[PDB]
């Protein structure tokens, strides 16, 4: 589960990168690129200039935490003896413990009602008046 | 007409109509053979004979029934009501027979 969410997050991070980079490129580059005196804006790609190279420190700072979140659940992994045979050895008792302690409570509902049923003939006929 | 003899014998006469039922039934025997013969891929009538058997039995039945019709004669109906539902018998005398039939008692 934890593994599932961390994996899918690590993957969707790539979709996030594609959403960021190529959309900021669609925000057409007003750069000093080396074409002639025609600022390449329409055919080779105003749009908000706040992300061309300022966004490389404006909007990526919005995502630095989104890329640091991954290491959080990394610490949450259950690191222990990979041969976990100890836990099953020590829990296999429970499969019989519950039934053994249960037999009493199983017979309880019925038999505690039955200590009353042995008398229920009278305990239910008594209401005569 | 009673050419040979009267020979009405109505009490016995019943036997004829009692036995015609056999011909009436065996009509179906005379029939089924025709289908059984036409089924298989047989001599047309040299293995059938059934058409002529059929016609013979039919004409026989018709003749006997007509002879019965004419042996009877009551013009369809006359004195229409309930035949002889108008009926009275001799049960009285039959019962009072006991006077003579019984009681030779002193002996």
């Amino acid at each position: 589960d934890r593994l599932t969410q961390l994996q899918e997050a690590m993957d969707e991070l790539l979709e996030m990168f594609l959403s960021a980079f190529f959309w900021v490129e669609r925000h057409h580059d007003l750069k000093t690129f080396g074409p002639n005196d025609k600022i390449p804006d329409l055919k080779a790609d105003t749009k908000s200039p706040e992300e061309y190279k300022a966004g490389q420190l404006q909007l990526a700072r919005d995502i630095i935490v989104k890329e640091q979140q991954i290491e959080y659940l990394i610490s949450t992994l259950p690191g222990l003896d990979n041969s976990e045979r100890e836990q099953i050895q020590l829990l296999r008792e429970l499969e019989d413990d519950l039934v053994t302690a249960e037999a009493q409570r199983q017979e309880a509902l019925k038999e505690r009602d039955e200590v009353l049923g042995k008398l229920d003939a009278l305990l239910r006929g008594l209401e005569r008046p | 007409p009673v050419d040979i003899h009267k020979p009405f014998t109505p009490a016995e006469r019943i036997q004829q109509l009692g036995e015609i039922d056999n011909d009436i039934a065996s009509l179906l025997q005379h029939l089924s053979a025709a289908l059984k013969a036409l089924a298989t891929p047989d001599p047309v009538t040299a293995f059938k004979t059934a058409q002529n058997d059929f016609f013979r039995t039919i004409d026989r039945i018709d003749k006997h029934l007509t002879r019965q019709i004419y042996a009877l004669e009551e013009a369809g109906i006359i004195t229409l009501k309930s035949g002889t539902g108008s009926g009275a018998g001799t049960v009285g005398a039959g019962a009072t027979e006991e006077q003579a039939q019984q009681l030779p008692q002193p002996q």
Binding site: - | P41, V44, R56, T66
Partner: protein, 146 residues
């Protein structure tokens, strides 16, 4: 083309007569609770049989023209041809009973069974002679008076 419009119209009329008779029978059945009369069923079956014969007759003499005839519609075709009920109208797939018909159990020694109108010849002879035979006396015994 127009010369067979009367043929197809006669087909339609005879078919409508079939449907009318069928509906009348369906009504008369439930009109009462039990089997009304065996004779009613007899008469109705005969009725159906006559116009079944009618369709059967109308098939043969012009079958070949139906074979040559392809789809050549008129007066309503190009419009109503959206709804795919045309397949249902033209289901040439045989129904389970049409399939379960058994050409088997007859295929045995099949390919003759014709040339048996001599049967009908003998039958005509016998029946015609019987029509002549109406002598009341002795019912073909041909013996003594009585």
């Amino acid at each position: 083309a127009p010369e067979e419009l009367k043929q197809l119209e006669l087909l339609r009329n005879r078919f409508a007569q079939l449907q009318s008779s069928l509906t009348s029978l369906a009504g008369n059945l439930i009109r009462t609770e039990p089997l009304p009369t065996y004779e009613s069923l007899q008469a109705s079956a005969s009725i159906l049989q006559q116009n079944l014969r009618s369709i059967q007759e109308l098939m043969t003499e012009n079958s070949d023209i139906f074979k040559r005839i392809a789809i050549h519609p008129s007066t309503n075709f190009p419009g109503r041809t959206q709804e795919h009920m045309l397949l249902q109208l033209l289901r040439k797939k045989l129904e389970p009973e049409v399939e379960s018909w058994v050409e088997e159990a007859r295929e045995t020694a099949r390919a003759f069974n014709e040339q048996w109108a001599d049967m009908l010849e003998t039958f005509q002879h016998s029946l015609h002679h019987y029509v002549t035979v109406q002598l009341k006396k002795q019912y073909t015994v041909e013996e003594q008076e009585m």
